Amino acid sequence: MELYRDPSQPIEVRVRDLLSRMTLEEKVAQLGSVWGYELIDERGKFSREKAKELLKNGIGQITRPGGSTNLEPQEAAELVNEIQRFLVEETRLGIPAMIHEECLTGYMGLGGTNFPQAIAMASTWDPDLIEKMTTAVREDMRKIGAHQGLAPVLDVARDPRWGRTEETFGESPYLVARMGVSYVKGLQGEDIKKGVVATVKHFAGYSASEGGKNWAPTNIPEREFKEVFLFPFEAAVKEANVLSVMNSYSEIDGVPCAANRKLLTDILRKDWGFEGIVVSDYFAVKVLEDYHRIARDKSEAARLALEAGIDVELPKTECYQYLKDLVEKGIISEALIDEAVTRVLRLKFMLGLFENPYVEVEKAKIESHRDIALEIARKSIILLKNDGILPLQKNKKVALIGPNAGEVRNLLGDYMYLAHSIEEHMKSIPSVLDAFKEEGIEFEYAKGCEVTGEDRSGFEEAIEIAKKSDVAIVVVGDKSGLTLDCTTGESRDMANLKLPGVQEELVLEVAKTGKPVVLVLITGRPYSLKNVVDKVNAILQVWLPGEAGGRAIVDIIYGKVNPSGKLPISFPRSAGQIPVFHYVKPSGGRSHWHGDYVDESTKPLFPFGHGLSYTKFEYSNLRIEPKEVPPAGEVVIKVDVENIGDRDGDEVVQLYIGREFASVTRPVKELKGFKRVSLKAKEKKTVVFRLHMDVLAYYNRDMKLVVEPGEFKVMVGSSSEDIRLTGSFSVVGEKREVVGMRKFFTEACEEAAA
Template sequence: MRAYLILGLYLMGAAARAQTARPVYQDPQAPTEERVRDLLARMTVEEKVGQLSTVLGWEMYEKKGARITTSAAYRKAVDERHIGALWATLRADPWTKKTLTTGLHPGQAAHAANALQKYAVEHTRLGIPLFLAEECPHGHMAIGTTVFPTAIGQGSTWNPALLQRMAAAIALEVRGQGGHIGYGPVLDLAREPRWSRVEETYGEDPVLTSELGVAMVKGLQGSSLKSGVNVISTLKHFAAYGVPEGGHNGGSSSPGYRELHQSYLPPMRAAVRAGAQSVMTSYNSIDGVPSSANQGLLTDVLRTQWGFQGFTVSDLGSISGLVTSHHVAATPAEAAALALNAGLDDDLSGYGYDQALLQAVQQGLVSGPGLDRAVGRVLRLKVEMGLFENPYVNARQGARQVNSPAHVQLARQVAQESLVLLKNEHNLLPLAKSLTSIAVIGPNADNIYNQLGDYTAPQPAGRIVTVLEGIKGKVSAATKVTYVRGCAIRDTTSADIAGAVAAARQAQVAVVVLGGSSARDFRTEYQSTGAATVPPAGGTAISDMESGEGYDRATLDLLGKQQELLQAVVKTGTPVVVVLIKGRPLNLSWMQAHVPALLDAWYPGQEGGHALADVLFGDYNPAGRLPISVPKHVGQLPVYYNAPRPARQEYVEMDARPLYCFGHGLSYAQFAYSDLQVTTRESTGPLKVEVRFKVKNTSARAGDEVAQLYLRDEVSSVVTPLKQLKKFRRFHLPAGQQQEVVFELGAEDVQLLNQQLEWAVEPGVFTVLVGASSEDIRLRGQFTVTGASTRPAAGR
């Protein structure tokens, strides 16, 4: 009897323990896959669909003085729709209507994130933590964060190691405020400068974009997503988004299969190989198939061929766009089914899946395993990030990490390295600090928002250093600095060209700061995607905005009265330095012919004024290189340097060459290249080609050089480019010093996609071109490949 009593007590205890035991999905010691399977088995269809909804986040909190709480809209979204993620919760800009007053400052942002997370964890049946995704193209797009140069400026650094440090700083600021996903980097190739989003890219070249993209991924994600200081990197945009027909944002693109795989996909593939855990689809279609419903890309290439293990996410509203824009689906349910079955996991908007996906499941358009596959990919990363164990952040610590002195200094360094000296006739630059009078002229000389680019939050007073402020900080009180705005970027209703002319005549040098702007304002209207809407002609107010998402151009000329202003100042005879602040290549032909010194800053970020003054006065020796070709005229487009042969023939009106080529950039120092040696090893293993040469600083001042190696396949079975960048390196050389540079080429550097659509290494002669730009070639050599190999191409 006693034995039965003991057994009964044991069984009762075991039953009680089983009832109170932690579920497998909440056990941090259990393998990730077991946790995900256990959680999926417990979820309803509605809960699964909800996990695939990433909804707009800035309406999900309420701010009343210092008190931050969840909003009724958020609680309803969690309770009724079981949402799994928010996007742009901490974002502030005119589109979101969040200002310095109504938006969240760093400490408040962390409190808001914790409040949102607490409700998701404690007020839902399964307690699944929330993902917070944030925009991170050149800094976290939130109040108080560090604003780095935009990506086209980052690309001009040609410095992957620097960008990795920058990305790590951005990740720290995002994670410290409660974010988990950083949207970026943008890996589109910008071969269409009329397109509004050139500023978000690293330029026109697949190799440069690949190297910088990999650096960004490594910086954002670090070595462990559980670190507490790293975020998931979301690659944008998959695929071929940067070459829309006519430059129309989101328009169709028409690369051939070979060009798609040889040029547009390699940066994505490199970033996936580097461990990127999220990929965003693009708005465009390719050869008639929208990217958000392209199984060949999302499943065959991305997962089967590249082995991608993370999750995919739509661009905002692109699933609905299958109905409203592309017209490949008749109903929202059909659109949801097309997207999910193609391999698109997560819905950025919250209305592309949601009820439409539930209907698709009910109608049998989406299978249970198909739904589980998508949900599992999202849940897996929540587990791997450790959110089930530690969903909250330390608000006080997070606030201290944002815009720290170290990050401000890093922003200055990125800006310094991004500056491209286009022209410096008679060594006008650097300027002497002993000048007694300087005229600073132009619409971008003292405008903080025009300096920052698109995807930028409102800025606290005193945070941004303008060009005018940077110049004033460099010279002594004895130097008279006169500032005249002269004109606006676009508005022609008011100008003070006479005042600018008077200031220039009385100065020893005139620094004229021109270009464009992506600065949004609260008068701008926006599409549902967040892209700005170009206002109709004849409006009462014209903003400076002529670039940034939605602002495509028909010409690349300076707008407004900027050209008139520049010509009037040049006519005074005072030496002129033009500083360009802009988001895309513009028509610089007149100033190239008439202005002695041109300095391209793109959008240089919060420390841009300091960086520009450092270069203008010689405290920093510029070494930025163009990541994109600059045309002489819009009628030349496209002018990217690595176009397929034959070489472009000349026009009646002008030649076909760009005004400034890819890779161009001057220095205050001079560098000589010598002693090229090319050694091939093929018989004892995989193809290896070693390229050695020497670079010497032949000047009296130290500086950085960017050595570039291009390759030409002399005879091939399919058409190949006249030249293609394969390797590059930025390095510092003291005055008079010499350094040997060694590059190693392998099979991937010489392969092509043959007529059978296989990746092939073909026997033949290859020419090595080494120099300081794609046109400034200093050394030439050749090597011969004797062996051959093939492998199937991705997606075939």
């Protein structure tokens, strides 16, 4: 028994033994991939004939054996078992494949639950719930033989033009990092042999493209890059031990991320100690030639990507096959191949693949997680505005109007399988209309208009039913996806941030009837609401929700659920205001010296952290101890919060920290902690934040990470603008350079109030 086959030997010994036995061809095959669909016949069964060509020298990964084949879970598991058997039994060394799938919003294939989008996950401000979600995704994926999920997205989004906004956790490095670490922890085990490799993406800066345009340059200076864009990735690497990273398609200031050794190696591996695999975004290696025009041919693209630190070329081997020729012609050293192969093999051994690469098909049926999806949807919906009309009385006659009220497709996000037997599977998802029926509401429905186009012919019918109702509920927003008819999603960037089509005019026409209007936004991004805000009575933001969307919206409208979502991204008044974010410097978020633009406020229409409730929360009794702390000390901040209203509800208590008179300019306020707290009517609790000085560190003039003596402002409240209590503490002592491992997060919890 060769050492590499022996499970009693340490992983490093198995790796070295395997590597020593491999040919150059075999090594290079471990750095590539093949699509699931390329390995099946027309009946969706594994094809040995195709495998003999594509897998004869082994393979790094199979791309989306469920997601790209439209197979049901048991049939996907059977395909995966057969691929694995061919590798284990019909190749010289018997190295098994790693399988990856998309899974941002749940496993992206037939049979998987469609959870609400990432931006909705962030809107819950509930990291534990997100960990529970990915723990369930982990089980789904392992059932079908998948080992790696391409999620989560840790890009920090402050540009709502960008069509991938919906896939992020919003604008706050702190919130994005906190949600990201929980997301990763749920997917990955403690022991990865029993979990799923998480893939943080897109490293790094991809959400800050020129003009919000997909793949356009992301030109970010160093301090901002470290504190805003890299921070969530750093936390995922160091605190959550994430095992995969995927690169950004964009260039930073002249260098494409896929060709950048300073980013993918010097920061990620050298500075941070990342030990897992870097996988390319799909075709990211090839487009070094085709799009960026910095590689003359496929073999130069391969060289740049391998040197940069990309281990596996996805979704199919294209350039990496030429790594063989580059070694044979003495252009690159085989040692650099060996380094990448080591990282791939290490992970395959840790996943348990050499001991057992198969799954039990009989157990491969994926269970529904509608319960988890519905809890996220209920906690994610945000009440942006309410003059008092909500919650509605069940006896009011409703005119239900708009394209998103009637079309189940438009509840789905860009990486939800049914968006991208299709029609048949779609039929299974509850509509908004269905939720109104089951609630027993008396209503009529008029579509009003389409999501896109200029056709106003449906307006008359919508106006007519509004005139005969007590209240109009107007449901507008996006179709999310990858094609030209979609208004949001990857590749669907929106310059002007107006609701698509004539939906805004539809809202205004309905409002002109003088009936009360509840505006329901089912969207992937913030839209400019400047022209409608004062014309409607209430506004609900529903980030593209699960299969669970309809029920949650209706539950909230009628007050069976008290809304508790808070914005994880600022809502701009208009596109020309971009960007707006809560953590501006003293000179940011304003024009000097008149404050405002000529034609526009510099304040967002709704700020970060905003979200209303059907009850009222009263904050009191701020304590901050001790008042003076040394530069690696800890401060304990306590506030009492009481539900003083008549309905039970959750409040998201938010901690902002401000600093002046540092050696560099600092945010007037930035989010540094938060806690979702449940409060029954008249219940009072204490929220405790334990804030280590490590969490407040920032980069100084010399690019060192420091804590400087001085005063920090503490602001606790219900949004970044609705601050309820303020105080301060001092750091006392000599400037400290923060070296090596440090804390990233405030620890937040609840105690009984006095």
